Subunit: 25 residues, 4 copies
Amino acid sequence: SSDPLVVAASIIGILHLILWILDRL
Amino acid sequence: SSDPLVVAASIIGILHLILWILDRL
Amino acid sequence: SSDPLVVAASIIGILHLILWILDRL
Amino acid sequence: SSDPLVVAASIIGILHLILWILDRL
Ligand SMILES: [Ca+2]
Ligand SMILES: [Ca+2]
Ligand SMILES: [Ca+2]
Ligand SMILES: [Ca+2]
Ligand SMILES: [Ca+2]
Ligand SMILES: [Cl-]
């Protein structure tokens, strides 16, 4: 388990990557 | 809970994203 | 130990960096 | 505490930011 702040940041990071990929495709 | 180093890095990462967004807006 | 989601995000982040480096080299 | 992999990724992430800043300055 992780700090809820870290879980939040990890999710935001992944969604950022996904949106970036979709933008370029 | 997380290592204090990881908590620090997560906060820095989020603030980086926020500042980037504000810069572009 | 960390949340499996955070472990996943950390791995993705590192592989992203590696691929970026290889792309530029 | 965190998974050693996550600690490693957090350190790499921060050093990446620092080097980027120094490069631009
Ligand atoms: Ca806490
Ligand atoms: Ca420690
Ligand atoms: Ca933990
Ligand atoms: Ca969980
Ligand atoms: Ca492990
Ligand atoms: Cl963690």
